[PDB]
Amino acid sequence: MAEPLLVVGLGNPGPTYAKTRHNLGFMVADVLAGRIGSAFKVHKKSGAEVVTGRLAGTSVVLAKPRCYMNESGRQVGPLAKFYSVPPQQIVVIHDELDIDFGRIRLKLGGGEGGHNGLRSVASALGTKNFHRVRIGVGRPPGRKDPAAFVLENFTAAERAEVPTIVEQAADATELLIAQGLEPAQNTVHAW
Structure with missing residues (x-):
């Protein structure tokens, strides 16, 4: 019993893109893995960034593509196998x-x-x-698709709720394995 579930963190490491909102996966996972007692392993290929940590009780595999989102789909496939x-x-x-x-x-x-x-x-x-x-x-906001704007942002407003996302993400991910998705998504909708 207890198979390691695959947790995929979306990150976009780029010249200016590594400083954007597209780096959620490895930016958030860094602090939560560090606390549970987990170090990241670099297995350059399909497992460029992987950490095995156990929240709630079961150990899961958190994988972060260190490539662009274009290449993200190419990472999960081989890794899962x-x-x-x-x-x-x-x-x-x-x-x-x-x-x-x-x-x-x-x-x-x-x-x-x-x-x-x-x-x-x-x-x-x-x-x-x-x-x-x-x-x-x-x-x-614009007459162009957010696609162009989301590649480089510096809006101080996004920073205000960053701590809020941290507490929610760290709690919901653990509770997800602890009980289910319902209790988790209910909490993030409650706070």
Whole structure:
């Protein structure tokens, strides 16, 4: 019993892109893994960044693509096969325009803000079914698609609810394994 679930953290390491809101995966996982007693291993290929930590009780594998979102779908595929884990019931932390910054929504689907980061993985797996966690970053105001704006942001307003996301993300991820998704998504909708 107790198979290591695959937790995918969406990160976009780039020249100016490593300082954006697209680095959620490895930026948030850093502090939570450090506390539980977990170090990150660099296995450059499909497992560029992986940490095995156990929250709630069961040990899970948190993988972060250190490549661009374009290449993200190419990371999960081979990695899943190594540990013989089904890439169906996976959780992926990612930023989306679905809601404003402060609260988050964990939902299964892919067609809002980060189309490529959704498409890359969805098209590679040949299906959706992924229940990803969407961090609300708001909808960048403009006559152009947020696609262009979300690649470089410096809005002090996003910083105000950063601590709020931290507490929610760290608690919800553990409670997810502890009981289920309902208690978790109810809490992030309550606070």
